[PDB]
Amino acid sequence: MEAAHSKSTEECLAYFGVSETTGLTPDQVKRHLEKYGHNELPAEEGKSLWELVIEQFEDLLVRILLLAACISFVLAWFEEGEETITAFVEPFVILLILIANAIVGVWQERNAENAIEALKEYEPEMGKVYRADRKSVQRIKARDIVPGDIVEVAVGDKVPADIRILSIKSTTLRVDQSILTGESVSVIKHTEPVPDPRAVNQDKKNMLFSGTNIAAGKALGIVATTGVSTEIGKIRDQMAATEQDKTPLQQKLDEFGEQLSKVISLICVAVWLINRGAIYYFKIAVALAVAAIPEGLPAVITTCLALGTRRMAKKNAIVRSLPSVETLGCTSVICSDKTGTLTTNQMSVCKMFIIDKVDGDFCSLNEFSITGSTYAPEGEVLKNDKPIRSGQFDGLVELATICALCNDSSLDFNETKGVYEKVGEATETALTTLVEKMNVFNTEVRNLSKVERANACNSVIRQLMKKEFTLEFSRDRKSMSVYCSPAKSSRAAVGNKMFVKGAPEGVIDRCNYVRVGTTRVPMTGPVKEKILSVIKEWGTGRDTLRCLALATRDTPPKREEMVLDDSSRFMEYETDLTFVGVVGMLDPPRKEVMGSIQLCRDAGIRVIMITGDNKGTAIAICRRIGIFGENEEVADRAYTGREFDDLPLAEQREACRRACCFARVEPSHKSKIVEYLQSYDEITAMTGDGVNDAPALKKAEIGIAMGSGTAVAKTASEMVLADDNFSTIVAAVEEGRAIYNNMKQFIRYLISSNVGEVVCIFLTAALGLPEALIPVQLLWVNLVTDGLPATALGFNPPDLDIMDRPPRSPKEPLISGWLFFRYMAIGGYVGAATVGAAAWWFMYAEDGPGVTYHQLTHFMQCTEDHPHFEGLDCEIFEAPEPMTMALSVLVTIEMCNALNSLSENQSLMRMPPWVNIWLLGSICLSMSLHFLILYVDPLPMIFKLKALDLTQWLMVLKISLPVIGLDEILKFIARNYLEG
Numbered sequence: 018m019e020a021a022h023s024k025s026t027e028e029c030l031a032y033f034g035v036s037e038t039t040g041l042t043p044d045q046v047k048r049h050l051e052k053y054g055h056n057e058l059p060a061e062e063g064k065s066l067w068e069l070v071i072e073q074f075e076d077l078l079v080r081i082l083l084l085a086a087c088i089s090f091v092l093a094w095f096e097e098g099e100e101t102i103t104a105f106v107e108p109f110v111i112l113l114i115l116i117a118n119a120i121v122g123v124w125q126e127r128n129a130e131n132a133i134e135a136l137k138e139y140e141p142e143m144g145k146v147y148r149a150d151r152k153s154v155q156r157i158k159a160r161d162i163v164p165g166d167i168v169e170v171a172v173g174d175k176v177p178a179d180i181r182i183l184s185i186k187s188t189t190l191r192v193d194q195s196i197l198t199g200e201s202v203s204v205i206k207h208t209e210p211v212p213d214p215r216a217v218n219q220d221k222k223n224m225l226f227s228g229t230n231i232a233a234g235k236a237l238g239i240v241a242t243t244g245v246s247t248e249i250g251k252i253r254d255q256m257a258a259t260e261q262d263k264t265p266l267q268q269k270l271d272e273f274g275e276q277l278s279k280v281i282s283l284i285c286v287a288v289w290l291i292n293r294g295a296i297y298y299f300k301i302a303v304a305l306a307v308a309a310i311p312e313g314l315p316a317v318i319t320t321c322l323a324l325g326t327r328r329m330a331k332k333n334a335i336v337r338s339l340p341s342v343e344t345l346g347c348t349s350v351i352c353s354d355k356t357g358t359l360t361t362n363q364m365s366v367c368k369m370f371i372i373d374k375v376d377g378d379f380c381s382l383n384e385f386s387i388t389g390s391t392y393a394p395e396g397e398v399l400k401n402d403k404p405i406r407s408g409q410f411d412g413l414v415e416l417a418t419i420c421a422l423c424n425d426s427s428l429d430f431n432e433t434k435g436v437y438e439k440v441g442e443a444t445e446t447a448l449t450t451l452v453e454k455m456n457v458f459n460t461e462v463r464n465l466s467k468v469e470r471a472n473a474c475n476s477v478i479r480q481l482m483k484k485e486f487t488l489e490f491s492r493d494r495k496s497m498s499v500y501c502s503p504a505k506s507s508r509a510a511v512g513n514k515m516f517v518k519g520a521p522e523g524v525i526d527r528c529n530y531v532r533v534g535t536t537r538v539p540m541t542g543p544v545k546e547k548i549l550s551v552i553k554e555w556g557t558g559r560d561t562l563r564c565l566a567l568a569t570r571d572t573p574p575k576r577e578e579m580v581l582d583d584s585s586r587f588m589e590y591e592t593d594l595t596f597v598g599v600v601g602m603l604d605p606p607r608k609e610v611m612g613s614i615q616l617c618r619d620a621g622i623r624v625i626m627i628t629g630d631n632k633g634t635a636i637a638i639c640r641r642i643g644i645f646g647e648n649e650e651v652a653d654r655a656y657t658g659r660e661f662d663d664l665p666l667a668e669q670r671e672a673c674r675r676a677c678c679f680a681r682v683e684p685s686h687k688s689k690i691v692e693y694l695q696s697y698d699e700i701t702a703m704t705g706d707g708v709n710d711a712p713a714l715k716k717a718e719i720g721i722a723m724g725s726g727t728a729v730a731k732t733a734s735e736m737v738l739a740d741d742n743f744s745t746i747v748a749a750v751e752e753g754r755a756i757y758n759n760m761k762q763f764i765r766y767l768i769s770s771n772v773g774e775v776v777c778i779f780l781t782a783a784l785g786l787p788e789a790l791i792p793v794q795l796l797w798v799n800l801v802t803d804g805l806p807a808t809a810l811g812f813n814p815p816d817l818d819i820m821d822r823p824p825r826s827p828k829e830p831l832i833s834g835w836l837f838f839r840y841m842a843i844g845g846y847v848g849a850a851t852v853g854a855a856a857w858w859f860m861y862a863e864d865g866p867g868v869t870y871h872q873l874t875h876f877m878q879c880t881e882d883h884p885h886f887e888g889l890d891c892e893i894f895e896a897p898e899p900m901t902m903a904l905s906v907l908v909t910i911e912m913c914n915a916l917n918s919l920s921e922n923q924s925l926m927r928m929p930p931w932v933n934i935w936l937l938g939s940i941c942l943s944m945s946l947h948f949l950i951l952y953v954d955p956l957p958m959i960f961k962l963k964a965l966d967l968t969q970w971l972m973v974l975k976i977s978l979p980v981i982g983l984d985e986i987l988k989f990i991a992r993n994y995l996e997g
């Protein structure tokens with residue numbers, strides 16, 4: 018049944034044709050079970066590290082290396098009757114590299130624990146129904162509940178399905194809807210229809226929502242919807258939105274990988290358009306692929322990311338997904354939940370007042386303030402910002418007495434967590450904490466164990482008066498009371514009191530006196546007017562507190578005369594009251610939240626509050642934390658979920674750009690707001706702690722959960738602030754930007770090597786030259802000998818002005834303009850210095866001089882034309898030395914390039930090459946690995962190399978060194994005649 022909240026109880030009963038007193042027949046159940054299915058959310062699996070690996074080869078860049086590996090495997094099989102001992106190394110290294118990258122890519126996006134499994138934790142396994150075949154309440158599996166049957170819920174129950182309330186059997190039914198609202202405050206349900214067909218969960222006080230729980234009361238209802246058609250079902254559908262997405266940097270990478278693939282298959286149409294019977298293509302096409310691809314990038318990327326995570330862990334931020342450690346770096350909008358995120362989610366009494374003195378039209382109040390933002394009994398009472406003893410004011414003694422006695426909650430020290438927690442409602446525990454701070458009888462608490470300290474002062478008060486019974490809360494009275502007698506008195510004794518608490522208006526009207534110290538005087542208009550004026554100010558400004566009036570009936574009726582089983586009589590028992598005091602409470606901001614907001618603003622980041630709580634307290638908090646100015650007007654800048662649902666699509670979309678405060682919202686509203694923000698192509702984050710935050714946390718580019726929040730929120734996030742420090746979000750942005758800067762410079766360095774290896778192989782094929790470099794070599798170059806210095810570049814002490822500019826545009830490309838022209842040209846000098854030396858050992862070299870008129874081009878004719886312009890041998894092109902001189906030049910050039918990459922524009926004259934010790938130590942590790950291929954006996958075979966002379970290396974150290982000057986020329990023109 019749709020819109021059950023908008024219908025009446027009989028209308029709902031009619032709709033399914035059941036009686037409140039027999040329920041469905043097993044016939045009706047079978048039919049409904051068939052038509053609607055079972056009462057449960059479908060599980061979401063999460064794929065396996067098989068088809069996750071399969072999805073690794075799913076992109077074009079590695080689709081190239083897999084195709085190439087097969088062609089390389091064909092080349093390794095059809096080997097001549099020569100070096101067949103280890104010619105398969107080429108294809109088998111590539112194939113290992115692919116699987117090695119495949120495993121590295123999956124592992125960084127970790128965590129097998131499911132968000133939906135955590136969500137089904139809110140499904141009860143058992144439910145309670147009245148069905149036709151039995152008189153007594155049946156207890157069946159919750160998954161067998163069907164729309165239409167009569168369900169019963171009571172104290173401590175998880176609600177089994179979305180239910181329309183039929184009759185409430187207690188004086189009140191109190192509900193905890195925090196999974197839909199993020200607020201623990203118990204909600205007071207009724208049975209009257211809620212006409213508005215677009216009412217929001219908070220407005221549907223005649224409904225029970227599945228997965229929520231019963232704080233107090235007993236109720237009977239009819240099931241409206243089950244399974245996936247519930248409010249928690251909506252949350253679930255948005256968790257299954259596994260529409261495979263990636264971070265803004267990964268997309269830039271994927272796009273860069275797609276631009277790089279349209280280079281390889283563009284040089285193949287270039288190579289082909291220069292000229293069995295074609296083994297020359299499938300030999301050099303493989304060399305083109307291996308060359309262009311900077312394989313090992315993942316390794317050096319992963320590492321950069323890995324050290325960011327590990328660095329972030331020391332700041333108490335746990336990054337559940339490696340790439341996300343950078344995301345906040347380029348975030349323009351941070352959406353944030355309020356309760357438990359921006360605030361502590363610990364209701365606190367921050368102000369209170371009693372009457373000072375009364376005189377005709379003059380009335381003055383003793384106002385006090387109370388510090389402490391937690392449930393811990395630590396804090397102090399101040400008058401005019403100076404400390405006082407609460408026990409000196411008799412009115413505060415009664416204030417505490419009322420708060421301690423008119424209370425069904427208490428405080429508990431959790432020894433495993435080392436913190437104080439509530440037991441019962443937050444608003445009542447605030448009263449418990451208040452009473453322990455006040456300590457109005459000067460009980461000695463300094464030396465109590467923390468567990469005894471929790472309720473010490475409340476216990477003292479409980480020793481003085483015996484609570485005989487509570488006139489529980491009722492809707493028509495908006496207040497509650499407790500009937501108490503002086504302990505150590507007889508049933509008959511006078512001195513009984515009623516202690517009342519409730520909504521200021523109603524309570525105050527039922528007062529005929531005001532307490533002054535231990536005296537009492539008539540309530541008058543001027544006195545009432547004074548009281549009401551401060552209650553009004555306290556609950557509307559930037560205070561906007563929640564105020565309770567506290568009163569006592571000095572002469573309550575005799576127990577006997579009071580009829581307890583009839584609550585409509587409770588109001589009149591609570592009359593002829595004496596006003597005592599007011600308390601004002603709010604759930605307070607975390608102390609570091611304000612600072613964090615300002616620093617984000619300074620980094621050009623927007624902060625938006627999206628909360629299930631109410632607009633008035635949403636706005637007040639926004640002012641406290643700096644999202645709004647204290648006096649700034651916000652009519653068009655703050656909205657409720659329902660106001661938002663009234664705006665047409667375009668207006669809603671614009672609202673997300675204009676507004677900063679969204680209140681009384683539903684889980685879907687949060688993801689909708691994030692969705693809109695993303696339609697302006699803004700990189701947006703979400704911060705939260707509740708189940709109601711999950712949808713939004715998932716849809717964001719990065720979801721950030723609070724350490725002390727819910728498991729659902731945590732499993733939907735990529736980052737958890739274990740200690741609940743909002744400051745860490747600022748530090749996260751800094752680290753995130755440092756990461757992007759690192760990648761920006763080590764991609765330049767590696768691709769520089771890559772473009773050089775491409776041009777080299779484009780010349781040893783268009784100039785018909787002898788094989789300059791081989792695939793087998795390049796794989797060791799790009800993964801091991803180039804990877805190390807690239808990984809060493811990540812040990813850069815970050816820029817000191819990285820947090821002062823705004824976030825980079827999403828459309829801003831990794832490398833473009835001058836940087837392309839830069840590495841593109843360096844990739845040309847390398848592509849000609851490796852070709853040069855490989856040809857130079859064949860000409861101007863004494864250890865094998867060929868025809869020095871460029872007649873090296875013809876290697877086509879060895880035994881084919883030996884009587885031609887020859888002079889000597891045949892097996893001299895496949896010599897190790899040309900490849901050795903080509904390799905050693907490639908390697909040595911990049912070692913300078915590594916020293917060149919220490920700065921983007923500052924010269925090595927102005928920035929010493931001994932800044933990074935990890936880089937220098939990496940060049941040694943590169944060298945001692947490069948010379949390890951030469952001297953170590955079994956290695957020089959596969960990589961076909963041989964060590965050189967003192968002069969041989971001196972020609973290397975003369976064709977590589979003048980790369981510094983080439984880059985220096987690019988540095989001068991950039992820093993001067995370009996910009997700056």
Ligand SMILES: CC(=O)C1=C(O)N2[C@H](C1=O)[C@H]1c3c[nH]c4cccc(c34)C[C@H]1C2(C)C
Nearest residue numbers: 073078079115118119122270274312313315
């Ligand atoms: C099998 C496997 O998991 C993978 C790989 O083995 N890789 C990456 C890759 O995803 C490849 C890649 C995708 N997009 C880009 C952009 C830039 C560079 C690269 C890539 C290198 C590719 C490689 C080989 C590192």
Ligand SMILES: [Mg+2]
Nearest residue numbers: 199356357707
């Ligand atoms: Mg919250």
Ligand code: NA
Nearest residue numbers: 715716717718
């Ligand atoms: Na996401």
